[model samples]
Target: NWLGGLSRAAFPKRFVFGTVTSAYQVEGMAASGGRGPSIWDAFAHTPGNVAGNQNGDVATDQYHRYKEDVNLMKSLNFDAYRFSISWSRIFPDGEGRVNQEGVAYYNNLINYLLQKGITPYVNLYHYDLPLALEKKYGGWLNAKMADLFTEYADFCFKTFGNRVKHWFTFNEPRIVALLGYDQGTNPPKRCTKCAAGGNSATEPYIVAHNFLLSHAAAVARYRTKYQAAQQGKVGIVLDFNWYEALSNSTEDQAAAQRARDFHIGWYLDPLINGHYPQIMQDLVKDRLPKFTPEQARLVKGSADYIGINQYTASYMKGQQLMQQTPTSYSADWQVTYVFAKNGKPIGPQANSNWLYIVPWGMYGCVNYIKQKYGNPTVVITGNGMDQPANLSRDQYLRDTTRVHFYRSYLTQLKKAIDEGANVAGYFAWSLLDNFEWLSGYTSKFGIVYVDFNTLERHPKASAYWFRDMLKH
Candidate 1:
């Protein structure tokens, strides 16, 4: 369905196009640069936690070769680079004192981007919380996290806000809460049965509550102190998968709506409207944490814009409620995730079980944010498909599937903008294949390939596909 005729000129001239990567995922020299160990450093080293026992210890070596990676972006004509700051790098202990070396590293990065004409869109957090903070303060579960996080954010704003005009407070805060606390699939792994015991139901709400407050506090700090002088915009990046109804049944339609609410509304409702969605309040009832009047004032209208990271879509079917003994957020929403309708899937499956090729859902996702949230400026912070982990070097080099994936998804995104979605920018999920969380080196989400042993970077066909598309 991706006919390859899509062009950057097909949309508004100001619609930003770029490539993306996260610090923990791409930046190696994990223990170097005077960096402190993060929860991920511990998680990845735990036997059986990550596939292949892989870790970010030497991930793509981007910390040392960022110049080369930046050159790659320049070669592709990318206008921006949306990357995250390693909280541990900035504050090795997550508080107390600044790591001047970390400050120097980011200064080099931001300065180089300016010299090369690439706008820096820096995110404050991307699941790489300094392990020191988690040990001292229970991390996001504790209210203490809000102040600690704000301090870190302020440091970043004051340090880098001069030339960096775009700042995202967090990348997929939901994923951090969901995967880290709920599913226990990620770092600081805590669930009912995980080695680090936790109440999935209660802890997730607490974590999400703390995370939302932290983001709002950071945004408030920036607006109050830095924005007037630094002249930058601050926002949050949320990852949501579109949910389509399984049938014409009202129950199925309601199921789909619930899925959307549980995904995006979980945060956006409080961020945009100052409270949790009525549906969430009624369902989670008392389980969902409440924000006070002062917090509400700060949380509401906190973002200058919104960034969404969408990958695919699936169907939803209503299911009768069944309460768990201890309760869980997954259980709080009574719906079955459906990958298919009748005998066929919603779309062709990608390498990950959760990712399917569902392009038009991009329109549904962007427009829903528009119609629901006053049409605020939106950026597609991250979007891309992955190839299977076992593909050969040549097969990986010739990634026709990935090329088509971007073509179709961007075309659908263009359609959303054409119909007035207030969409302003897009960034592919990754610049290169590197450490992929729990899956480690088992997943390939990069447009560029990284041969693990050699750490050699090769632009896949999709990279060139973008290079060609953006030229017109």
Candidate 2:
């Protein structure tokens, strides 16, 4: 037994166990299935954006192999599968014309999941904005995006709401704002200094505000138009990495709190409390967009539940802004992240540069949500660490490190639930080693290892571990 004899029965009676993947990350046939280009396609096609200049043109070919993949989930005893819908795939031009082919594809996938006894958790958007939308209206940077996104989501709820009982409007919109607009590291790259053009400090805030509005609009539509009969739940997914103070000093503790404020609090505060965090309001000020009374009412308590993507944690210490430092969204936090304290590492490192295997972070984040957000229903949306892709097939399939990672993190999750966190479900980061954004195929975060060349999947030791634990 892993985690000192943890098992399925250790969780709440109806708690769900599952795996997740995104449309662009796993469903290949990118251009052939009447799916128009996304900013990711434009970004990956560029020479210097992704590692090894790789793209997801044929990513794991999940479009054609979902039945096989669904079988893997069945064999593993997974109760659900969380997958995202591609905006461009559904409406090739982002809006106006509907692609029947794209609609049929999802209909097939969703119908098959039900046929196989697996619940489908559908997420409306996951970072892959249609390139046409970006080219025409600057994507989330414009207020119009809220209406457009709501329309896209309205179609999804109307079409799939009957069977897809759980829905998430967006996945890590903060990441979309920070990486795509502020850091200029992902698609539609823009920043304070990038040649592409942007004011990072202001753009990130604008993008995030638009996301909150879009999410609220979608949820409102679902509740008013579909919820009465469909009986479905809608929520948004936020990525939270627990931030602990490096020391008990007041400055360090304050800095840690500010980091959290600027991270998950940036979204949740508005969604649950009707405004941004006080620290953000004081610091970002005018740069952070204001939520009008109507928008606040729509956004506040918009989600029926909240999905948390927990993976790692870091130590934080106060950092004074240097005279030479530029005013950017990242600089606004005025804190430094530390991975170690007193010459001791916080936790083991993963292949992904940013991930630190701090399992206790799971417990910290859930309790924080319970205490601070008034115990809204929560789901562990995505949780897993990646491995370098250079390993041989056998080496990748053995994945003992991953098994340990899940065991430890899940034990912490169980601890949180026992202590009264309202966590309803837990989903692993991925089902197969598919395209990892920016890192492309260089990082594998899957329980099932995929042969990039042959597109064959071999269940890793971690997958079997889940099977054994989830088995009745």
Candidate 3:
């Protein structure tokens, strides 16, 4: 019943199911664990930046209780855990010294994951850039940021390579580039008029360029030095917000495609091919940076696998044919995105403001990748929906909506795989309720409920649903 009309047996024999989380989102102990501060620390601690001035200072305290957490994942019957490393934890200031205590902490973590039979899908960065790097070398605003990121990545490979078999260089670089610099929505909150003061036109492109180079460099280093010895696959995580055309009109369809090109294709095109899509070049013109031939060599075909985190989709109306506005990434695509058409919502709204329950969007996302990108290896790195925030503990555990969410979504995912998407694995958004950035703990996206007052975990109905679905 948990799997509805579906079952794991209906999919490919080796398909992997997992739970995904991030370091800052879950691994609290901000001041402890030999950790240095990250931009999130600075962003969250700043008064009024986060809702209720909330921060991840003691978030679920996963750093101190990972054993209990790992045991919970095992009990939930997850085949793998896709978690990120806090760069600040490993190199407190992003460089100059290694944090041995942090290394030992992950050692115990990985050791326990292996002992408990849950595979590790280690992601290096999940938007928690070290605040020190931002102060020192302007972070991703400068090209040298690539050098610093490669150094950190190389160190992690050398230290953890023996046990960590799967590696992802960064998570959602486009989001970091666009939201952080273009809209000033995310950390290092910079834009033309924002408090930090950045050029929306030029800085988002710069941050994205540096991030691509950083990823390429890390993959190149791994291929040259570690892959043979360590025998691990390397990739990066990209979050796709699927776009649907407003109507059958060609203009609406083209607008939706442009939104996608700007979103996923911005970075992925460069990695797979050698340059940005022609649409971007034509739109941004000189503001867009050019990659050197050497950089192009390294950038092309860098991913051993592609990690896609598909959440929701939006409706796109053609704005490209309309007059353009002042320079910004938002206008770069010239698409008007809306969640509703006429009076109907795209789907039911999730607890998060941005997320809509668009299960069919998952099929659209996977199919887009298969048709456009030649279908390289894929993993649905994150795909769980959020539950309401104010529910009682008892109510939280009865997550029928989330259960239906997974069933509906996994049904679409299975459809994509059956139609030739080459998807290798799937991972839920989280294993436990933890800090939701900016929203603070106001939103919970976990199957396991964590009582902030007691730090006790209660597995929700979705967990039991997953257990029954996955026990085979």
Candidate 4:
């Protein structure tokens, strides 16, 4: 009866079914294959950056064993495989010469996925900037890094765009700006000026401006040079978490708007409307970064589709004057968030600290994008739960919670489509357990569990659930 309900409520005809992984998170061989060092490599090696001093030195060994990995995807009946290309792998030094071996690996992987009837959706940057780029040019802080990124994008378009129809310029640009620059939680740790009462918003805003320009440059290149010949679509994957005011009070409602405006509108407004949100401009003062009119023209209407990555929703309340003290992270931004009271009805607690169960959040996110930015086609680029590394193999494979998680989220997705959200596809967070950034191998978010010791693949219950979900 349960299977019948799922099958009867199947997705649209062209809906995609697949999973995702990143080069640095799963490929391993950090130093092998002529690949140069990335920020993660540097951060992991630093005394206190990563837990257990673990790095992706030999992750899932996907670098050498891609063929087996593809086979695993095929066996799962995946229609597509969304993966990222390591920038350092392509340009070890970030600018000078290309790495033939590194190029060959992706070329091979792309070709193999084609042969197996699996569509390849390639992401250009995934937070693993070449360390040389970070050191030589201060990474995203310097606008010139955009030119280097454009060069890398051109190479990917010319080499692999022929077969790969879907291309994402960047994954989670907000987190790249917030975590790396604002909170100092990630690599190349640089805290925002907010921490010091200086212009905390200026640096991250500038970094985001460059990121937009970089994405626009790549899209323009594809449209001008490659789109005509390759017939491929290019866009960026954005992370969108819904926000609710803590109470019915006017101040709380305003705080809710600020939270959403800062998180989602900050990025989407620039991409679709050619400028930043008015609320962000008003609140950040002179900290708002400027973009040339020409740049805005290039950035707007650049995306073929917007990839929305929805996780959990948050509740926000107006910050108290005392709570705005410089000691807190929110003190600089002047905002505070908590769990929404009486929000969505369902979601299971699993792995990771920030993540919570909130399937209805996905529905709200899809509809919001449709209403605010037009009903552009969308793909769920990343979504899943994580668990401890030592969890039982059987629990990993037969995760009843995950099965419920998928069902609940998919139900919300179906509702969005019914409401004309123009939903096109879905891709699970990952196919196998691999090195989680910063957390190292501490969190497992894979359908196929990996025995980090032996690099063995054990299909969990969620994998079987997905296979059955596809059969209908």
Candidate 5:
């Protein structure tokens, strides 16, 4: 039934449909256009840090082939394109001099996107921090990074806000803090067990604190300086995996709530309510940072809308015993994430080890945000599944599974909207198969296939699905 006969008309009036890509993931020429190295450059170059020991030195070459990609989106009947800007590209040393070439490139991109009738939704950061900032003062680990980011954000708002109406200050700060500090899988690779030497128990909280401060500062700047003139909105992107209790027991139910509080509520509570969740304050206690009265005033209601990236779902079971010993951020939650409750799994697995295809999870996630955060405007900044990268071209092009993934998830999203979730838009995780971080190219999350060798673009079956569904 084509997934409930889903189409653009199925959504609310003017509900945006688009695709998202980050600069480092798609824009090659890591060194060209006067772009300095980002932390991803350093991390991917280090042995054993990435799956293939590969770097984004020459990714999908979107830096050179953006026009072609824009054309692809235009042909797909997409309404917008959500892409991030490389900080180091604009400020090679993370904050010194303007790279006119970098400005020119983004200008060319925004102009072309507009020419093709695509609204540009720009994100300031997407896991790629300038290496210089990290080396200078510990990056997100330090409060100094906030002002520097504010300066950079101000530059972006002044430079591009005239054309780009939708702005996201950071894409998934939770992942950046947890993965980069708590687990040390991503850049600046700082964790207790990693060679980088970090106190996972403490650093993740500190990093999260700094990220919130930075995000708030940037939002304040945009509102104070640019919003009125530019006629734009600014927000942050957070990833959410809907957590359901494994059973009817109060312990499992409480564990599920704790999972939500730690993951999505970590950022949203501060943004919407001006403080961290009570459970977080009680558990993390002294370890969790507190915002000053002035800072709280700035942070509370900082976002014009909340951007959420919903991917998968899991069942939460209370741990058998809460550890009294020193614990990391993930351990602090005191929950065991269960993919299956009974014998049945939450959903079938996607090619990516972490992603499970749980369409109902999208409906639950959006409604949770609506009920908890008072129906604040929401944008699905990133949502899509991946396939194994080694699949043959024909197999890759025959992306029937991905087509079902989008259709089913989007169907759930529509149900949420019908139930008054206040969702404004949805952007697929990516446009083309580019650099998949950490996993490198082992996972492909693109509607269009990219020939890594020739940098050719081949629209997959799912791309055509969107084309037909979004037909005007």
Candidate 6:
């Protein structure tokens, strides 16, 4: 069993407890239900793109077993479920035809959660744009795709907004831009590394500008047309990692600030303050897309709350590249990352390469959002760790490291709330062990263990630990 437990008294009233799952991550039946291809579909099918060449074609078969999963959430005392809708499933050809079967599947899922008294926070996009759109219009690279996204968002609001009170426009827009467009490691991998720099930052900023406009258009539509009548909340989720300068030097501090501004400011500044950060502007110059006065007015203060997904912190130090190429991507810039020193306290490491144990990072991240963005209501959208190899099932799922991660993060969250962060909720990374994206089925991040061969559900020690903790 996990070593320690938390008490209900640790959280305030309206505190939210739930688990997060992406459609492509857990929902199997990739080709079923009239669902068209996604960038993930294309990427996973490509050999060498995923570990063991794994794909999510039938990852968890959650499409067929969603009822059981919902039951699992109820048993775990989850007050909500944050799930994404597969754009390919909804719009088979991206923008042309509506897939009735796909709509039915999600409608059933939303109704099931509502029936169990679990609030559903539905995210409109989760990095899986319809492959048809990507192929035809270069995906988000073309501003026209924003209208398609807005169309989908409008459809979702009209259909499911009654039950799904909290709606997220897009999950981690930066990941989408970075992975899909700039880095080219994700599906539909098109590495326009040069798009983020040089004489032409227009491509990335234009794409982001379109994304923001789409978000604002959807929000305006919902607020003006549906919100007054529907009684739901709409927002966006952004991912961040707090960066600390490696030394007390001014250059190191400036580098850290630049890193944060590029990562977080790219989206937050526009959404909150009606403009992009000055640092980004200074670097990109006029190549950074400018919003029309009307667009800025609509985009600013559009969200009801902001969803923050944080995992760890990084130590930053500036570096000079011998021959730096002009690339629009910030990652192309030379910067040294000094991991928290060996002897210092660190969070447990997860299976993913990017994730490490750093509960305090969550604290700093939430506080940063509050202080920087005027302290809007915030939700801890995703947090958890994976078990290590050579561990038994009992020890694997009832992991002390996982428990510690949650407790430490939640303790920091509690502190953030006390400091007037207006924090609203927390959702674990996952409810069940399922697909782990590019890592495929190997990396597990669920509180409940799932046997791939048997498809059996077994509550891990951590699950029971959390259960008992919630009882307090």
Using alpha carbons, what is the TM-score of model 1?
A: 0.98
TM-scores of the candidates in the order shown? 0.98, 0.98, 0.98, 0.94, 0.98, 0.92
Task: Give candidate 4 misplaced runs (Cα > 4 Å).
Answer: 1-4, 192-200, 319-333, 340-348
The positional error of residue 226 in candidate 4, measured at the CA in angstroms, is 1.0
Residue pairs clashing in model 5 are: none
Please give the TM-score that candidate 3 achieves against the real structure: 0.98
Model 6 scores a TM of 0.92
Q: How close is candidate 4 to the true structure, as a TM-score?
A: 0.94
Q: Write model 2 residue lDDT over 1-472, tens digit each, in one string.
A: 5545878889999899999999999999999889999999999999988999999899999999999999999999999999999999999999999999999999999999999999999998998999999999999889998889989998998898888999999999989889988998987889988888998889999999999999999888888999999998999999999999999988899999999999999999999999999988988877888888999999999998899999999999986544434468888898988999999999988999789999999999999999998998999999999989789999999888999999999999999999999999999998999899999999999999999989999999999989998886
Question: Any idea what lDDT model 5 has?
Answer: 0.91
- Candidate 6: residue 63 Cα off by (Å): 1.2
How much is 25 displaced in model 6, in angstroms?
Answer: 0.7
Write the residue-wise lDDT of candidate 6 on 83-195 in tens digits: 99998898888887889999999999998999998899999998888888878887777778667888888888998887788999988888776765566666556554433
Model 5: per-residue lDDT, tens digit, 1-472?
6645898879999999999999999999999989999999998898988888988999999999999999999999999999999999999999989999999999999999999999999999998899999899889988999999999999999988888898998989889878899988887888999887998889999998898999899988888888788888988999998999999888998999999999999999999999999988878888899899999889999899888999999999986545356579998898888888669899999988889999999998999999998999999999999989678899999999899999999989999999899999999988999899988888899999998888889999999999999999
Residue 160 CA error for candidate 3 (Å)? 0.6
Pull out the clashing pairs in model 4: 193-200, 194-200, 397-460, 397-461, 398-461
Report lDDT (CA) for all predictions: 0.88, 0.92, 0.90, 0.82, 0.91, 0.80
Q: In model 4, what lDDT does residue 318 have? A: 84
Cα-lDDT of candidate 2: 0.92
How many residue pairs clash in each candidate at the backbone level? 0, 0, 0, 5, 0, 8
